[PDB]
Design a protein around this ligand. Sequence first.
Ligand SMILES: OC[C@H]1O[C@H](O[C@H]2[C@H](O)[C@@H](O)[C@H](OCCCCCCC3CCCCC3)O[C@@H]2CO)[C@H](O)[C@@H](O)[C@@H]1O
Length: 265
Amino acid sequence: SPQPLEQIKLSESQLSGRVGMIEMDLASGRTLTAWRADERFPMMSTFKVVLCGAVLARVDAGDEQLERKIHYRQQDLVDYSPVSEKHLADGMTVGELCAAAITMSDNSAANLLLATVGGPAGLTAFLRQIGDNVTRLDRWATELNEALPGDARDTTTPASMAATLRKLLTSQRLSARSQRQLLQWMVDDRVAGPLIRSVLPAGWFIADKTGAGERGARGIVALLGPNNKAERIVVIYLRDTPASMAERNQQIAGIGAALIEHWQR
Ligand SMILES: OC[C@H]1O[C@H](O[C@H]2[C@H](O)[C@@H](O)[C@H](OCCCCCCC3CCCCC3)O[C@@H]2CO)[C@H](O)[C@@H](O)[C@@H]1O
């Protein structure tokens, strides 16, 4: 593979889309690669990580419990509810809802949690509280992936999302237990985690959340590093490409290959 920045450029040429990317040291915040890092991209389902950061903040404050059982109804369900559709009779805990949202991309779970933090406006207020003045959520889980040209709703930037993830995971805004929980949810992603491990060389750590939307939108927030360590945050978003899902996945993977082959920078 070529150098990361050359590979990112090649991905734009091949996809005819915009790529946004940051590579950042998790422990320090050192930015290593940046590309379109202040441009806006739809978050898609990557928002579910920040959502559960907001939930954990409420837990830390004594305003929520991960144990608390929420008993919802079939009319509450939205498209793609692989876990939540199974628990109409018995409900799910707040922690189970976060696990379903992050590890399975369960949309009803996400919406149930989103209302607990005050909806899109409440999650946006939480982002402002932690010093992210850019990321914004405007819609609910099944409408926020529309990725209309020119539409600022439901967007982040690579730089903002990376900084926000670092804040949630490491800055002691969340309690130690909550930081550990958020990280474990990402480690446990079932949608892409096992597939990524299947193509990573031995020794490379992965934790992640992916997203997909219209007009080719695709993204991943991840922790990656050699020696089985979460050394770096990597955030990659794609927008405005007509390419197949397979090709969008392959281009993201190719950026990953470039980082892996050329890690010491
Ligand atoms: O010299 C480094 C390595 O180079 C190759 O590894 C290949 C690997 O066989 C392939 O499957 C992967 O594809 C990349 C798959 C990446 C998956 C997604 C990455 C994510 C992670 C972070 C968020 C953005 C994207 O490339 C690497 C690097 O060339 C060799 O196979 C391996 O034995 C050697 O250790």
